[PDB]
């Protein structure tokens, strides 16, 4: 009889990886993208509290929406130019794309889903920190919302936070995951 | 109408010092069948499976999959634990077990009502050539490059139905 799904094995999931074709070898995972209902409260949230820089705020008015993109880099890196800071914000390694449909934030009905309550699909994303103790005692301070508090339920040492539109951000220290 | 410059502008507050040092490390998705998850992401786009952690206790497991040279992966677990933690851009793909024999469950991609999350998106030096291979490869598209107004601007998707973009830095400006 089929048994019951125990997952995969490590050997038989590496054994589904081959290794990268050469034509693929420069490429790299640009963005995460994310729908928000309001920049006002997404910008200062992402900037103010998570510490991530506006790169570049792109307005597309034919199709009524804009596109805020936030990463991990020295603001003083940013180019001036318009054409020069487009080309330097597409091939930055892990940015995070914020989409405004315009009209939403003032729509007291609209909302977006965070994937983690039916229909379940993308989960979160995950910022590595040197301390989620001393980080979260820092969100606490801040007002932030807590999905699971550090040393609340399982997993302790790991967190997770929720952004203005309730996405699920991790926080983890890398050094202490693999002790659980 | 959407923000000013201004506006948006006045809503960004420089980095305070401790966060100095916190990096985007991982985007989450759930995978129904992770032998066909992984053929795509390491076969197809080329990343590479860095780690894999099981949680029997709760019956799922967890690939953390990135755009990194396989032989820069510590041999000794907990030394590998903290350095796949501890790169940028990786891809966490959640396999609940048991989905990959369920012919009703499918996972839900953002795109269709109720929206949120919207794609990941790879950024290439041909857009072209990439999905040139790709289509031999069999992949499905959502949108091809050539297609409407955004041209040389692709999404594909993912064994689940994951939106992908698939953009080329250097020709973005022309579409913006
Ligand atoms: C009750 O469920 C959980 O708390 C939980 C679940 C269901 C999954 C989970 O996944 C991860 C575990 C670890 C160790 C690292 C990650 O980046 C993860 O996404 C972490 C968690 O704390
Ligand atoms: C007409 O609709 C679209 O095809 C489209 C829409 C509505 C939005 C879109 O957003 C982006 C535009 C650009 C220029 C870069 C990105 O990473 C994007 O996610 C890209 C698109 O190709
Ligand atoms: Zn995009
Ligand atoms: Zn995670």
Redesign the interface.
Known sequence: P?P?????T?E???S??????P?????????????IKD??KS??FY??V?????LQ????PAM???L?FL??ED?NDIPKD??EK??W???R?????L??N?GTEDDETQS????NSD????????????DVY??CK?FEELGVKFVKKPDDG?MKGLAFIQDP?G?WI?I?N??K???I
């Open positions: 089929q019951a799904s125990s997952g995969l490590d038989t999931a590496f589904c990886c081959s290794d990268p074709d034509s693929t070898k420069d490429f790299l995972l640009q963005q995460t993208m994310l729908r920049p006002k910008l200062d900037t103010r998570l510490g991530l820089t506006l705020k792109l307005d597309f009524k929406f804009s805020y990463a991990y603001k318009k054409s487009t080309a914000t597409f091939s390694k892990a940015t995070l794309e989409t405004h315009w977006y889903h965070n994937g229909p379940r699909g993308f989960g979160h994303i995950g910022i590595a920190v040197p001393s980080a820092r399982k539109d996405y991790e983890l890398p050094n995951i693999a002790t």
